[PDB]
Amino acid sequence: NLDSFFTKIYSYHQRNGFACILLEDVFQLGQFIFIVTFTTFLLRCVDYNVLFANVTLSDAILPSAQCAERIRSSPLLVLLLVLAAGFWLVQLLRSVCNLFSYWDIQVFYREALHIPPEELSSVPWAEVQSRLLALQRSGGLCVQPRPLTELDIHHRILRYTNYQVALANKGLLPARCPLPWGGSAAFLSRGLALNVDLLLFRGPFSLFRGGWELPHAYKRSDQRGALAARWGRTVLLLAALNLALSPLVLAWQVLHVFYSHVELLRREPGALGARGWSRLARLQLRHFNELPHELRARLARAYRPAAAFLRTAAPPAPLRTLLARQLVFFAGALFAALLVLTVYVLAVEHVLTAMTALGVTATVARSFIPEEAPQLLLQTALAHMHYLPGGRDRAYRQMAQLLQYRAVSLLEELLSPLLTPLFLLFWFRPRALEIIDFFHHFTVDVAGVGDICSFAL
Amino acid sequence: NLDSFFTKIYSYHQRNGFACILLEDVFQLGQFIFIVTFTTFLLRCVDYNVLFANVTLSDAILPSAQCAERIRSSPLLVLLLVLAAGFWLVQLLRSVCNLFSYWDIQVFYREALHIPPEELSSVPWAEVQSRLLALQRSGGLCVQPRPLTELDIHHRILRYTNYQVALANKGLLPARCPLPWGGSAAFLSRGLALNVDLLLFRGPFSLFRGGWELPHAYKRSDQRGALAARWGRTVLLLAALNLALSPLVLAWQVLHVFYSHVELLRREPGALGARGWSRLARLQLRHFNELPHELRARLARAYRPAAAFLRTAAPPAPLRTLLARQLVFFAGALFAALLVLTVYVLAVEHVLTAMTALGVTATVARSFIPEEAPQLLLQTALAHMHYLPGGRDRAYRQMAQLLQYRAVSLLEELLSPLLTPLFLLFWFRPRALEIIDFFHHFTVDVAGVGDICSFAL
Amino acid sequence: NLDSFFTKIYSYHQRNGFACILLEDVFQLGQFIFIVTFTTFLLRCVDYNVLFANVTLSDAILPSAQCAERIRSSPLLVLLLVLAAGFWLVQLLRSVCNLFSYWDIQVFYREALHIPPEELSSVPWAEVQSRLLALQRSGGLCVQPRPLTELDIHHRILRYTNYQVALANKGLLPARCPLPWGGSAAFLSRGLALNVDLLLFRGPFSLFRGGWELPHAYKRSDQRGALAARWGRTVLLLAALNLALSPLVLAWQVLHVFYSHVELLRREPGALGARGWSRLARLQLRHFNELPHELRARLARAYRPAAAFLRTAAPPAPLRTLLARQLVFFAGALFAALLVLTVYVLAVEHVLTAMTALGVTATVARSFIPEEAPQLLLQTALAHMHYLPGGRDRAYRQMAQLLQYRAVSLLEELLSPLLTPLFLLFWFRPRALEIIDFFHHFTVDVAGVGDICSFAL
C-alpha cells in the first residue's frame, strides 16, 4: 500500500522512538491481560466470608484446589475467558505483524537518511521533509517520473481526513437527534466514529476497498438507487452485528471507566472539574491538508483564552443563585448544630453517619454558588479558532458545545455501546441517497495521487 | 409618595424578577422562623443525659409531653417566644403589603411598556430610561407640564444618598473617638446607620416627615436654639429606646454570627482571610447622583489592584518577623519531638491533646511570617477610586482603613448593640447646632423637584 | 582595623536595629543551648518502658535521682556535654565582644549623625553615604588628607569579595570533580567556603594576616617554590584538623537538618518542592564592587522569569513519561481494588498497612508525570542575569545547575562534613604554584586603600 508507507514514516517520528512503540505495544497487551486476570481473580478467588469476620491476606487466600472447583462451578465464565483469550491472541498477532513491519521501516529509514535514534527527537520533522525531497532529487526510488511535492505527500496521508472533514462540513456526520423540549444534541463517541470508518474507508465491506481509488460503479448516475439499496442492507447487517456485540464491549467499558474514575475519586474534584477538548471540536476545527500535530499545537495554544472567555461572560441566573444561597445556609446551620453536638463522646454511632452526607452537601453548595472584557477574550480566542461552526447567548452556547466537560465525555463513552446501533439505524438509513450523491459530485480525479475531494483544492 | 414610585421601578429591575422578590421574602420569613424554632428546640428538647451515655437519635428524642412540661418550666422562654412571634407577624404583614404593592407595580410596568419577565434580565436598564422618556413624550402621565429629565429622575430617587454623602464629606457621620495612645477609629456598623436614618430621614420623629420637603420652621434663623434643644431631647429618648432594646438584638446577632462563622470554620481560613469592602468605603467613595449598581461595578473593577497595592508595599517590620522565626522554630522542634514519640502506641491519651494545639501554633506561625512596582499599583487603583480621603505610611494606612478585614467587620457588627447608645450620646448631642446649621445653609429649593443639597449641583 | 569600622557601620544599617542585633544574638545562644539540652533530655530522661505500656506525661517522668544515675551510667556523654558547654562559652564571650563593640559604634553613629532608631528603617542607605561625605567635608575625622570617595569606601569593605569573585571567575575556586560517566559536579557547601576563608583571608594561618596588605615575601619571584611548599604543608595540617573535627559537626548538622526537614514534613511538599538560589549563583553572578543588598534585590527581581523559563522549555522525555503512565495506571488499579475492599469492616489490620504506601506511590506517580515562548523568557531572564557562566540543552543544563533544588542543597549541606577534607586534599594541593602566580600577577597597589585586584578596576 503506497499510502501506508508514508503513514508509517509519519507515525514513526510522531511516536518518537521505535523502542517507544515496542514498549507501548507490549505494555498495552500486558495491560489487557492484567485487567482480565485481576477481575477474574477478584470475582473468583476472594472469599468475603473469612475477610468480613462474620488477619494476613495470605491466610485469607483460599487454596488453589478450592479455586479450581469454584471456577468449575459456573460454565459462563469459561466462555467469557476463552473469548477474552481469543481477543488477546488476535491482538497479539496483529501487534507482532505491526512491530515486525515497523522494525524494517526503521531499518530502511536509517539506511536511506542515517539519523541516529537519539537524534530523532531533536529533528523538527521539517528536515525529514527536506531529506525526503533531496531523496527524490537524487532518485532514490522511482515514485513516478515527476518528483513528489508537499501537497502530494500531505494528500497521500490525509485523503480520509479530507473526506471526513468535508462530510462533517456538509453536516451529515454529527448526530443531531432532536431534543423533545428543544435544542440540538451531539453524539461523536469513539464507537460511532469506528463504525463510520469501518463502513466508509477501511474494511472488506467498505466503499473504499483498500482506499486506493473510487470504483467506477459509483460514477454511473443510473445505478444510484441500486447502490443505495445495497448500502441500506449493508448498514442493516452492520447494525445487527453491533447490537449483537454491544453487551461485552459495554461491560469492558464499564470496568475501564470504573478504574479511571475511582483513580481520581480520592483526589480533589479540581481535576474532575477541569474541561478538555471533545472530538466534535477535533472534527469541525481541522483545516484541509492538516497533520494531527499542528492541530494539537493550535488547540494547545488556544486552550487558555477559550476557558477565560467561557468563565468571564457566563449568562446571569438569579433563581439558581437564590436557591443555592438558601440550600447552603440550611446545610451550614445543620452542620453547626451537628458539630456543636459532636465536639462535646465518640460512641454516638449515628451522628457520624449523617456528618459525611451533610459535609458533601455543604461542599457541593459552596462550589455551586457563583461569586464576584468578554470582547477581547473572544477576539484572542478566535485568533486561533480560525473557523467557527441574543448573540451572546448563542456564542456562549456554541463555545460550551465545542468544549465539553470531562465527566460528560466519559458518560458519553459509557453510553456509546447502547446507542451504537440506534443512531446507525435511525440517522443514516433514511438519508441514504444524498450521501451517495455527495460522494458522486464532490470527487475529483487527478494524475498520480488519484481521488481527491473538490473541497481539498 | 412620588419618590416611592421611581424607587420601586428601580428596585424591581435591580431584583431582576417579581418571582425572585416573592421567593426572597417568603424564604427570609422562613429563615427567621427556622432560626427561632431550631434554637428553642435544641435548648428545650435535647437531653444531654441519654446522649452522653453517662443509639438512634429518634430513640434519644424524648416524648412530646415531657417537652411540654420542660417548656412550661420557665416563664422567661414564654415571653421570648411571644415577642419573637409578634416580630414575625409584624414583618409578615409588612412583607405582604410590600409584595401586594409590587405586583400591581409590575402589572403597570407590563401595561405601559410590555417587556416579558424573561426579557428583563437582557435589558441594560438604559432602555428602561429611554422607554420612560418616550412615555413622557407620548404623555403617558401628567407628571408636571415639563417632561422629566435624567437629572430629575436621578434626584427623586437619590436625594437621601446625596444628603448622606454631603454630611459624610463634611466629616460628621463617621464616628472618630480618639484612641488613648493616638490615632482615629471608625465605627459605621449597620446599627448606627439605621439609627441615623430613623433620626434624620425616615420615621415619625424624623426631620423629614415623609421626605417630601424641608419644613419651613428650620429656615428661620432665630429658632435654631429651640430646635437644637428639641433635637437633643429626641436623641436622648432615642438613645434610651435603643439601650432598652439592646440585649435582644445583641442575642440575635450573636446567634446569626455564630452560624455564619461556624459555617466557614471547618473550611480553610483562606476565605476567612479574604478582604472585602467596608461601609465607610461605600459612603466616602460615592459620587453625587450615583446609582448603587454603577458604584458596585466600579468597586468590583477596582478590587484587585487595591489588593495588589496593599500586599506589595507593606511597611517592613524586623522585630515582628524575627520573633515569628523564633516561635516557628520552637513550635517545629516541639512538633519534631512529639511526632517522633508518636510514630513509634495509640494509647498515649495525652499526646493527642497537645497534637492539635501545637499544630495550630505551627500553622499560625508559618502564615504570620513574611516572605519574598507600588507606584503603578497606586496609579491604577486611583484611576478607578476617583476620589480619595512618611507619605507611604499615610497612604498604606488609608488604604487599610478604606478596606477592612472580614473578621474585623463581623466583630464590629457584633459589638454594634453595646456601642449603639454610647456613640449617639457622646458624639452627636454636643455638636447639634452645627448639624442644624449644615441643614440650614446647604439646601437649595428648585421648582418641581423641591429640596436639593447645594453639593449635588 | 580600618576596614572593620566601615564593615560594622554597614552591618548596623543592614540589620536595621541595635536592639535587633542584641536580641538576635542572645536568642542564638539560647537556641544552641535549647537544642543541646532538649536532645540530652530526650536521650537521657525519656523512659520508653512505661510509655509503650509493654497516663499523664508527668507521671511518666522519672525522678531526678533516677536521671542522676542514668546520666552517670555512661562516660562519653559527659565529654560531649563538657565540649558543648565550652563551645557555648566561647561563642558567648565572642558575642559579648561583638555587642559591646556594636553599642559603642551605635553611640558614635548617634553622636556624629543623629538619626533616631525609629528612623533607621526609613533611610535608603544613600543618605547614609551622603551624610558620611558631608562628614569628610566638615573634617570630622582625619582619614587621609584626600577626602574619601565612593570607590574607596566600596573597596575598603569589599576587597575580600573582589578577590573571591576574581578567583571564581578564573575557574579555580568551585570544585569540579569529574563524573565517572561524564559531566561536571559543583560543591560549594558552607564548610568549604569557611575553609577557604580561614585559609586565604581571615585567621592566624592566612596569607592575608589581618587583611591590610599583601606581605612582601610573596612579591619575590624566586621564593615561589618555597612559599608553595609552605602552603602545601599548611593545607595538609588544615585538612588533618578538619578530618579530626568532622564527626561532631556532622552530628550537629544531622540534628539541625532533622528538625528543619521534619518541620516541613507534615506540610505539603509544595514548599519542599520549591526552587531556591544556590551559593554558586551568589558567587559567579556578583559584579565587581557590589554590596550584598544589591545582589539580593537583583535575584529577588530575577527569580520569577528564570523559574518560568525553567518550567516552559524543558526537554522532552518519551520513555520517562511512558513509564510514568504505566506505573500510575497500575498503582491506580491496585488503589481501586484496595479501596473497594476497604469501603465494605475496620478490623482488617492488614489492608490499612499498604493503604498509605499505595497512596504515596499514586501521589508520586501523578506528580512525576508531565502534562500540557522560551525565547522571551530567556531574554527577560538575561536582562537581569547580566553575566552568564544542542544549544537549548546546554542552556537548560546551565540554568538548572545555577539554580539548584532545595532538598538537594540540604543534602549537600548534610554531606559536606564527610567531603570536607577530601576535596581540600585532592583538588587544591596539586595546583598550588598556579594559585600563587594568580595572587602574584593580579595584585595592584594603590595609595591609601592599598591592595586591590586587577579585575576590580
Author numbering:
A (entry chain B), B (entry chain A), C (entry chain C): 191 to 244, 259 to 548, 552 to 579, 585 to 601, 607 to 674
Q: What does the literature reporting this entry say, word for word?
A:
Macroautophagy/autophagy is a fundamental aspect of eukaryotic biology, and the autophagy-related protein ATG9A is part of the core machinery facilitating this process. In addition to ATG9A vertebrates encode ATG9B, a poorly characterized paralog expressed in a subset of tissues. Herein, we characterize the structure of human ATG9B revealing the conserved homotrimeric quaternary structure and explore the conformational dynamics of the protein. Consistent with the experimental structure and computational chemistry, we establish that ATG9B is a functional lipid scramblase.
Full-length ATG9B, N-terminally tagged with a triple FLAG epitope, was transiently overexpressed in Expi293 cells. The protein was extracted from membranes into detergent micelles and affinity purified using anti-FLAG resin. Further image processing with and without C3 symmetry imposed resulted in 3D reconstructions of ATG9B homotrimer at a global resolution of 4.2 Å (EMD-17789) and 4.6 Å (EMD-17790), respectively, while the local resolution in the core regions of the symmetry-imposed structure ranged between 3.2 and 3.8 Å. Although imposing C3 symmetry during refinement improved overall resolution, it introduced minor artifacts in the cryo-EM map that were absent when the volume was refined without symmetry. Most of the backbone and side chains of residues corresponding to ATG9B amino acid positions 191–674 were visible in the cryo-EM maps. By contrast, the N- and C-terminal regions were not, presumably due to conformational variability and/or intrinsic disorder. ATG9B forms a homotrimer with a pore at its center connected to perpendicular branches formed at the protomer interfaces. Each protomer has a lateral branch that connects to the central pore and the perpendicular branches. As reported for other ATG9 domain proteins, the ATG9B subunits share an extensive interaction interface within the homotrimer, with an approximately 2,494Å2 buried molecular surface area per subunit. The conformation of our consensus structure is in a transition state between the open (state A) and closed (state B) conformers reported for ATG9A.
